[PDB]
Structure of protein-glutamine gamma-glutamyltransferase:
Amino acid sequence: GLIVDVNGRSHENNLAHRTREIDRERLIVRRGQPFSITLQCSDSLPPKHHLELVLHLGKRDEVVIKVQKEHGARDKWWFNQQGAQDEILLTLHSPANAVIGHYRLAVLVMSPDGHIVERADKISFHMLFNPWCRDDMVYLPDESKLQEYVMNEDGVIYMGTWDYIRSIPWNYGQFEDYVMDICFEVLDNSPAALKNSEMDIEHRSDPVYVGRTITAMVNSNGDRGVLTGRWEEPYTDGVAPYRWTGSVPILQQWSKAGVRPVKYGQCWVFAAVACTVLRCLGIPTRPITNFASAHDVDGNLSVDFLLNERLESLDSRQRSDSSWNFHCWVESWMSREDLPEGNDGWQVLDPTPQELSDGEFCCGPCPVAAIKEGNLGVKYDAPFVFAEVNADTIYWIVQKDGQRRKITEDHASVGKNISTKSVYGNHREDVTLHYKYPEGSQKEREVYKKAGRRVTRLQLSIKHAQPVFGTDFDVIVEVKNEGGRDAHAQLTMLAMAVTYNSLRRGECQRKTISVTVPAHKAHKEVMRLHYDDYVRCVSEHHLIRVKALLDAPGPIMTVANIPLSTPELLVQVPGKAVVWEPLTAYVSFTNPLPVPLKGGVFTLEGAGLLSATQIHVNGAVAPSGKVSVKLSFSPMRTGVRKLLVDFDSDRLKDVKGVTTVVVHKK
């Protein structure tokens, strides 16, 4: 009868555990780090009476831990008890291999004979990974990187083409309301948890297991996964992937709907959502983007790509055109005690199912080091991840008489400018060398040799002035003869619309010329692409793949992907911003299309600023007319925050904007 109320001191514990952004009113703790709560008593522990503590995990007590009285093991939970005044200070010490999850704490007061004389109200708390605790497997010994890879809620995911990289800001929002609760829900709806709940809980102490589970639930899991993938345009009953500016709306939707795959997502949306959840649970994570991605190859390090003389895949039915313009995945920091010495550090987790086992096989965790050094023998999915960044595709002109002509290509190579956001600033950090030895290096030769990667004048090149969607433009194809004698050759050029995942769409023009380019001189040919022609074939990403063949008197090829730009939203939220103080944000742009756009919707969101919110343009924006809306709202948390905005319309899609707003109030 002595315990009047247990006090978790969450405002305090949560501050110490870097979990208070999530919530202050409930105890959210990290493992391997102690936490202190108090027992407010009415009087005193009856003479020969002592305290007992037992922990409960699982909706059905799948796991119960009796916490030690003191000097405990190292991987053993234990507590220290001390009296303050009219309350008892209980400092709980958890092992660094503690199971993450929602615990319910039962403090028992007992008779000296072995019987419970009273039991206090079972209070619950959540436990996350602790990369700041040196004994934790996710330990990262640099506080500045944990701030970006765990604590930062605003990221930048790179896209576009390797020679023309674009950035799209993303609101990971891992500390937005309830996103933590949904993260444990994703773990609770997985096959393993459904099949055997208790064993699954027991495995939740492992960053490898939990990382592989989250990566699997984001998309590959078809009945309860988080997102439904749709690789092409008619996104009939859902949101198009290029619409999202953050992960929280997808997660709230998935849970709100009773755990129901969200329509729809594409590779970078799976990675960003994976990032939000792993960062939330405490595993250091960063979205990485690969340009010229050998995703399509399905693990094969050698592909000969047969084209006909008209420069086309031999089978008219097949729509895929080799390597993706880019492809995204995620890198998570953790030590790999499940593998030989040396694979510790960043692991590649690819939520995007692998090509040829239909939306079934996600990738990783795979040591990025196993990729660099070519060890395809470690779990998980090293061959597939090594192919993604190393596969060798050789194109061939096969004639109607079976003669195969090898196309020489200058543009070549896969895994071009592997990028991730910079820890300081929003700069692109080229992370390629973490993945591969420089091209041609003898080091590259001996790894390709080890792993099975095959290991093997006129100059063709395509150039453009970065066109804006809506305009007709020219693209130059220049043949440089840096030889001594004159050279006459046949120059074939085509321009076809494409999707980032290399899905061939509309061949909006071809052309073959006969050329004689003189020694040390260069011939420049132009191809004029027009709006009314390419609106017909281009998609939400507005991409045009230009190719040029130069049958050199073997044949020479060069491909270029042209991403046509959309206007950039002007986002402004003027005057000093203060928490819980109403403010007005202003977004505006000018229709670059000589067509009216209707169905204009602006969607706004920001971690700590506001949850996705829509502004419907009433009417239709006239051709070349300026659009201008505004929304009022009151920031939720203080800090340097980023406001994200998306604009969609019938004729203008994929239009973004971001602004930095410093939220005050000391």
